[PDB]
Amino acid sequence: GSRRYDSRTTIFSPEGRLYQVEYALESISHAGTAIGIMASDGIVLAAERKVTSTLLEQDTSTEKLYKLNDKIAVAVAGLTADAEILINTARIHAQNYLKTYNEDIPVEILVRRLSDIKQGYTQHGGLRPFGVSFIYAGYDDRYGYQLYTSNPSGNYTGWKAISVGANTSAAQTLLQMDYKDDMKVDDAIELALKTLSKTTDSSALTYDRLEFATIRKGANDGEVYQKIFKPQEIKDILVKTGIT
Amino acid sequence: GYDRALSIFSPDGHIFQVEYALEAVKRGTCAVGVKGKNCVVLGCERRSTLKLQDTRITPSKVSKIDSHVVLSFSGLNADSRILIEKARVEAQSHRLTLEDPVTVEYLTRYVAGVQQRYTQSGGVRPFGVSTLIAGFDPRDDEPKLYQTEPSGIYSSWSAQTIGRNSKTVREFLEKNYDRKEPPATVEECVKLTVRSLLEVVQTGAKNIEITVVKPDSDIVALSSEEINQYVTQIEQEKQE
Amino acid sequence: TQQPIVTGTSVISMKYDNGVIIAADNLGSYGSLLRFNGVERLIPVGDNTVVGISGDISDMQHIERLLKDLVTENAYDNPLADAEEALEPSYIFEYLATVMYQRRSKMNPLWNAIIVAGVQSNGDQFLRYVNLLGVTYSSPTLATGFGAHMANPLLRKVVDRESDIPKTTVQVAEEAIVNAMRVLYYRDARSSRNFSLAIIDKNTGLTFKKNLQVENMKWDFAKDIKGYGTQKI
Amino acid sequence: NNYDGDTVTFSPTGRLFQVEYALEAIKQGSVTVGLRSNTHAVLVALKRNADELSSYQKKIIKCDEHMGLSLAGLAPDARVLSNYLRQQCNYSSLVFNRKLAVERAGHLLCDKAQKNTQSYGGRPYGVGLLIIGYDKSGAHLLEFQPSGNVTELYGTAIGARSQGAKTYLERTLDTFIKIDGNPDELIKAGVEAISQSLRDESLTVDNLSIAIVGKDTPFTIYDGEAVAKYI
Amino acid sequence: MTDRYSFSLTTFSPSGKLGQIDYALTAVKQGVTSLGIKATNGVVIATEKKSSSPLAMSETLSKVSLLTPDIGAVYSGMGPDYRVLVDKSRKVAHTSYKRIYGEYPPTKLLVSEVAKIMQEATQSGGVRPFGVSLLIAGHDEFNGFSLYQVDPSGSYFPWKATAIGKGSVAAKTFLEKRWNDELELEDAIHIALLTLKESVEGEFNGDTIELAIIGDENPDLLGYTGIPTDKGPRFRKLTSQEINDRLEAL
Amino acid sequence: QFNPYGDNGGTILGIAGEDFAVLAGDTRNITDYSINSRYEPKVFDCGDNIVMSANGFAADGDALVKRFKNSVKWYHFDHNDKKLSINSAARNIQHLLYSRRFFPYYVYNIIAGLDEDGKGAVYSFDPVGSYQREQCRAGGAAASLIMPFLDNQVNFKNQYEPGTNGKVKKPLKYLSVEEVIKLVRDSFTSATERHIQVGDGLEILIVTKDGVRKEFYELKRD
Amino acid sequence: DRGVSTFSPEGRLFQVEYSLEAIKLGSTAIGIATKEGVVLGVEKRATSPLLESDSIEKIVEIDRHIGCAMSGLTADARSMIEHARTAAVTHNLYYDEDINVESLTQSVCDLALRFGELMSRPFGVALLIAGHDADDGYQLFHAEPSGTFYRYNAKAIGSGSEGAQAELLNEWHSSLTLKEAELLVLKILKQVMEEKLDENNAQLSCITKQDGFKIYDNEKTAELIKELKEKEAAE
Amino acid sequence: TTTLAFKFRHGVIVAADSRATAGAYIASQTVKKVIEINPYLLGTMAGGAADCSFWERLLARQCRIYELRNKERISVAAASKLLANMVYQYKGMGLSMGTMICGWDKRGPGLYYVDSEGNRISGATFSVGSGSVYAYGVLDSNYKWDLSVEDALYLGKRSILAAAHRDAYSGGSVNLYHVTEDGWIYHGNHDVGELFWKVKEEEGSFNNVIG
Ligand SMILES: *[C@@](C)(CO)[C@](*)(O)[C@H](Cc1ccccc1)NC(=O)[C@H](Cc1ccc(OC)cc1)NC(=O)[C@@H](C)NC(=O)CN1CCOCC1
Ligand SMILES: [Mg+2]
DSSP: OGGGGOOOSSOBOTTSOBHHHHHHHHHHTTSOOEEEEEETTEEEEEEEOOSOOTTBOOTTOOSSEEESSSSEEEEEEEOHHHHHHHHHHHHHHHHHHHHHHSSOOOHHHHHHHHHHHHHHHHHBSSOOOOOEEEEEEEEETTTEEEEEEEOTTOOEEEESEEEESTTHHHHHHHHHHHOOTTOOHHHHHHHHHHHHHHHOSSSSOOGGGEEEEEEESOSSSSOOEEEEOOHHHHHHHHHHHTOO | OOOOOOSOBOTTSOBHHHHHHHHHHHHSOOEEEEEOSSOEEEEEEOOTTOOSBOTTTSOOSSEESSSSEEEEEEEOHHHHHHHHHHHHHHHHHHHHHHSSOOOHHHHHHHHHHHHHHTTSSTTBOOOOEEEEEEEEOTTOOSEEEEEEOTTOOEEEBSEEEESTTHHHHHHHHHHHOOSSSOOOSHHHHHHHHHHHHHTTSSOSSSSEEEEEEETTTEEEEOOHHHHHHHHHHHHHHHOO | OOOOOEEEOOEEEEEETTEEEEEEEOOEEETTEEEESOOOOEEEOTTSEEEEEEEEHHHHHHHHHHHHHHHHHHHTTOTTTTTTTSOOHHHHHHHHHHHHHHHHHTTOOOOEEEEEEEEOTTSOEEEEEEETTOOEEEOSEEEOTHHHHHHHHHHTTTOOSGGGSTTOOHHHHHHHHHHHHHHHHHHOTTOOSEEEEEEEETTTEEEEEEEEEOOSOOOGGGGGOOSSSSOOO | OOSOSSTTOOOTTSOOHHHHHHHHHHHHSOOEEEEEOSSEEEEEEEOOBSSSSBOBOOOEEEEETTEEEEEEEOHHHHHHHHHHHHHHHHHHHHHHSOOOOHHHHHHHHHHHHHHHHHSSSOOOOOEEEEEEEEETTEEEEEEEOTTSOEEEOSEEEESTTHHHHHHHHHHHHHHHTTOOSOHHHHHHHHHHHHGGGOOSOOOOTTTEEEEEEETTEEEEEEOGGGGGGGO | OOOOOOSBSOOBOTTSOBHHHHHHHHHHHHSOOEEEEEOSSOEEEEEEOOOSOTTSOTTSSOSSEEEETTEEEEEEEOHHHHHHHHHHHHHHHIIIIIHHHSSOOOHHHHHHHHHHHHHHTTTSBTOOOOOEEEEEEEEETTTEEEEEEEOTTSOEEEBSEEEESTTHHHHHHHHHHHOOTTOOHHHHHHHHHHHHHHHOOSOOSTTTEEEEEEOSOOGGGTSOOSOTTOOOOSEEEOOHHHHHHHHHTO | OOOOOOOOOOEEEEEEOSSOEEEEEEOOEEETTEEEESOOOOOEEEETTEEEEEEESHHHHHHHHHHHHHHHHHHHHHTTTOOOOHHHHHHHHHHHHHTTTTSOOOEEEEEEEEOTTSOEEEEEEOTTSOEEEESEEEEETTHHHHHHHHHHHTSOTTOBOTTTSSSSBOOOOOOOHHHHHHHHHHHHHHHHHHOTTOOSEEEEEEEETTEEEEEEEEOOOO | OOOTTOBOTTSOBHHHHHHHHHHHTSOOEEEEEOSSOEEEEEEOOOSSTTBOGGGOOOEEEEETTEEEEEEESGGGHHHHHHHHHHHHHHHHHHHSSOOOHHHHHHHHHHHHTOBOOOBSSOOSEEEEEEEEETTTEEEEEEEOTTSOEEEBSEEEESTTHHHHHHHHHHHOOTTOOHHHHHHHHHHHHHHHOSSOOOTTTEEEEEEETTTEEEEOOHHHHHHHHHHHHHHHHTO | OOEEEEEETTEEEEEEOOOEEETTEEEESOOOOEEEEETTEEEEOOBOHHHHHHHHHHHHHHHHHHHHHHSSOOOHHHHHHHHHHHHHTTTTTTOOBEEEEEEEETTEEEEEEEETTSOEEEOSEEEESTTHHHHHHHHHHHOOSSOOHHHHHHHHHHHHHHHHHHOTTOOSEEEEEEEETTEEEEEEEEEHHHHHHHHHHHHOOOTTSOO
């Protein structure tokens, strides 16, 4: 019968690893590098688009940075199509929470929910896991600014600074070196771009090969603003930090 | 629905998927449980390969199931969340239907039953998780410490460890822990739990987590400095 | 739950020494309208059973089809279908009785009153009643609807108890049935002159009589009846 | 070889190996004998024990007042099939006030076993049954194979070393068929038949199991000191 | 019976590759060339009508399809897969949008819905990925004109101009030299015909080429008058004659 | 509107002796003012020395008896031909009845037989399963006519010993089967006189350790 | 791969035969039936000295008149015990009586072969079901994952089973007392166990008509062990 | 019916009449309205005879499984709650039950009122049934915590009698129970006919009645 053709996506190896999760992580390691850095007065999200073309319409393009709600955003590394499935689920979850409790969803709760969905695909159903790793950048009134990551295993952890995708080993070393606790957003912006500039597989880091975003309390009085950077705004910040 | 039998017997009478789930536990960070005369302490390893971590928001290794019971684990982190959620739901369901909080033995039996169910259900793989469940029964001053594992077997322990290099710390506990006279105070119990982790951990900085549970829903997690004082005193006595 | 539309009136029957007799008129009424005049309400099953049905005709036709299908199904993989493993009156009745009670228990009844008349393998007379409620009973005489009120009293004068059955011949029993049908034609407003009669004998087998008529009727005395009390002319 | 992984697969020569392997489980099972006359039908079964401390596994199961069977192979599968027969015999009584014909009981078993040989996921039944009964056409004996094949016979035997008893019945055919109105003599012929399949061991009091049904005899099972008469 | 293939047929290999998606992309590579170019006041999509037999009436086979009045689609790869995707795309435009908001979806959101359908065929049980790459051109009020590519994985990218299929590598190079941000629609059609001639072997005329545009509103194609706000479809398929007229000025 | 229930009349009576039990019932079946049958059995031998009668709506009564007889059959299959005790049968019948709590069997049920000590036993049920063991019980149409008579002549209620004047009761001396059958016949003869649904015939089933015996007596047919 | 309900060429279900191998690896459990009662005893086999041995529950009550010992993958037994307890109590609800030991055992064994592609595999545990009823008296059954159950006068399951069964072959007779049976279980357990038998690593239990099913205290068992040592040293 | 139960220093008394009614007709006069859940638990029956009997026996089976699973006797609070949740499923469906779950557990003597309407109430004194209103008068006026077992049994018996006399749908006989920490003890069946006259003479009460 059908058993003959079943790959068995949800099994342990003799060493106690989940084959498909490990292979999904191998896929993600070839994806464009995404970096998240958390500061005292905000969060930075930086990400590299993969070998683009001159004929790609950049200003209407979105492959890395997505908005979940007004307070929370995500950077993607892996299969974009898979990520959009999860992103729409997360957007719905955030709205369900808001309808139920009349309060914006705490960041961790949203992260846990998505991570639980990913976990399910590794334990039951016989389906391949989502080949996606997220960096969650968000704010709530309990813990303030928060950075999380989740991977196809459904495991999630909190970070001060973190990278996913390609060259994370090199990128994490550079972040661990120059990061300090009393750091500010403007400094974190510079660190993120410098790290990408050194870890990139491309010849040079340009505006057309980047997606960038910040979450700042730099909004008029006690409130939070999400800024998805436009192509011209990425070009300006590259000149300001002295990369181009 | 996906019905495929993943956990099955082999010619030599082994269920490999359940045994490979134990290998996932062996890979997991070390967890230790020690019960004193009037308390139980849960110690947990934090691997220092991950720095730049935000320790405020990172999921803690010890989880409260109810106000009087806690659960720590070794193995796959994502798998543990599913067991903990189920355990927490059952704990409230028990209070709701029977008007008493769960006993530690009952909660352990439930969690172990879930783990077992995933070893002979179609389309699912076993949990790659072993748990240490500790606490005090309602209106009782006797300490309780149980262990579970992927196969679904569970048992009570005077002291026990699970995870990577658990063989070494179990060796330490077997010679150091005396049943006739267990750690009389909280200090003695915590000290013995830290000592046991220092056989394996590496550095005694942010790699050791300690959680003390006392009777009548008195649960507290020690801080870095409080633990560091234990690490200091242990090694100063060792230099002799 | 429904209401009966096209209906059939009384079915009457009785036991005699060697078998059973059953009869029913050929009318299908539509309320007070005597709509259909050629309706057969006695339905033979094999050569040993006749099922007489009163009540809703659409449900009767449904039952008729179930019985026809029952014969077909019994013949399947059955070399003794026309012998030892042929359908018995008791088998046919219990099947219907099962169906009737199940249907009432779903609040969707077959709006009928049924009498299964026949002769068993061992020569024993079979005569049992079942209706829309699933209520069953047996008696030396059985009748449905108006027949219960008018025919039974007349038929019970012939066979009052079990011991009167061997003393009753087929000629006497048929005479009583035919007389009862005449009485029902006098007094039942939803009856017709035309009727069918069936005899199931253990020796002579199944005799099915169609196109019978009520005859020897008394009407002459009507000419003398004038007015409603005081009128003389 | 490559075509024996499941029941849904024919071999290149048109064989169903899983069904043949299920047939093999019957041959490993303990011997049981069936035979009949015109008035009665008899089952004789050699029960098997695990060891000297253990009991002797029951081989005969009652299905109705007028019908029952003996088993050889996987006992749990016999429990499932006998339970099905019990329900079918019972459906016939409750609905039609009719005792189920033995021939029709065989047709139902055939059809139930067949569904397990043509579908994926399931498995064939691993048991052989000998059904006896008395209905409106007299005494009957049936042999059930889990391939689905059901056969009406005067006498037969299934299980280990069953060929010896089957040969005996083939010689005795003309004699035991005529044993009418004599239950004890018909059982004697059955006990003598099953004796042709014995090696080393002999028929003891807790070893032998007998059942009978007939004209004025409900299906009854005899065990223990009740069969000492026939030893 | 029952569909017992409840498990994924597309899975990660040790190298991290999703084999069936790669193989689907290989099928797209073998497919006939199709392209899309975005102008300032319109979009053009084009492809070759590769007729399987001269006895076959190639007019009955439509490679370029209307999805909504302001959105069109063309493909490269497996034709039957494309046909069913068009049926689903047309339906989802109504069920998930028009029946809710009372208007047709914007290009990017319809593309998003099509992409979702193709992603699900890449993860759901007992199915293979679609063996097509789509080029979807469209217009809506707030986003203006747009052109999107959709791959077997479900990934989609917005393009100024692009090509897919047989001679896509050469065609994309050709488009890079000719494309600018000041192109009028007629200029884009001209460039589309030049680009497409390079990949075609045999006959090159209005009967062997299929070409459609997203441009100005066509009130003559609306089918009714009386409602000022309804001005007609922006999608228009060019006729055989209209193509041949532009091949003389080529 | 369709009424799924009916009333087939009839009356039943169960009396328990020291080492026997009787279950009696008239043989008349009726609807409204008509007679369906003058002899339609209402009390049945269900096996294992248990007799049963479900009085009220005949279609429901026949179904319940049919189910209980079936329950006895499967009790033998499932428990090695073990004998179903009267107390076990009663509990089983409760569950048959309550399984239709929201569409009841419209019957009053009585069973009779012997308990495990060999003494006479009668169990009485309501339509939804409440049962209890009794020494004396009449059920059905004329139950209210008969029960007061049995309270007086079986349990000696309101009867005292002469001379004492209400100070000392009449002692509870057991009854024989012959004395019981007299009370049964007089009960039904009296009921037949004053109740229109009672008459035609009387069939009594007597249960002893030896088995189940029957006795039939004619009644007035008016 | 291959079906879960597949027959081998010899006519055996692969999975059932493989589950029997798992039971051979399990700790020893012994049952002895007498006319004064049935005795059940088990090897606890703690994996470490820190493991509180009294929490090892390999002997279990099903009803007041039925007990149960297990051997093999003991986690698999929990749902079987649960079903057994439910069956026993449910029968008491429907029939106002105790349930027959055979009927209870049959109910447990009906679960056994409910596996396929229902649960995904057979049970990896064997059960010794001991009890008493009025019809057949004191009984001992051995319930396997094949769905088969044999009644026994005495039976041993687990790692030291064939060695223990041979010993039970010689020692059992129809006139055994309860006290004699208790010592006999302790004797054979001590013989097949790896570690030295004491009150902490072995557990006794019995079922009598009067007192019902009882698990023995460690103080009570300790005395029976001391009584055993002295009687073996007596000759 | 009339049923009552009350807690006191020495446990809990449970009393009930024995009349069963079918309109004006007295169907039975020997009915057990007290249910034996387990040796330390009792249940009363008022309203639907079949309903009370069936659900409480179902409760009893539920309680026994509890003991097997948990190696421990169920509490009165948990037992009453299982019943309450069981009947709550069938709320509005026509069930008619008025019950009291009486027992002794780790918290001492326990008494819960549970009905088909959904109420579940812990209390020291309860009386349910058509005659409850008559019984409450005697209870409330004579009830103390420091009551002897002898006096307590009489109070519960006398309270039923008061109701049996006045209420037409209450009577027959009185069944008494006493629940201790060592289990429940049955204190006999008392015919109201004989009991009434006895109490009248000894107590002097019921002066208006002639005897
Ligand atoms: C008093 C007597 C009535 O208010 C009390 O509530 C008793 C309680 C009771 C408890 C257990 C067993 C018997 C009685 N209730 C009744 O007697 C009820 C009152 C009642 C009548 C009608 C109802 O339908 C709406 C509901 C309640 N009577 C019954 O339940 C009656 C229908 N059944 C029985 O009497 C059962 N007996 C009758 C004789 O055969 C044996 C069973
Ligand atoms: Mg009368």
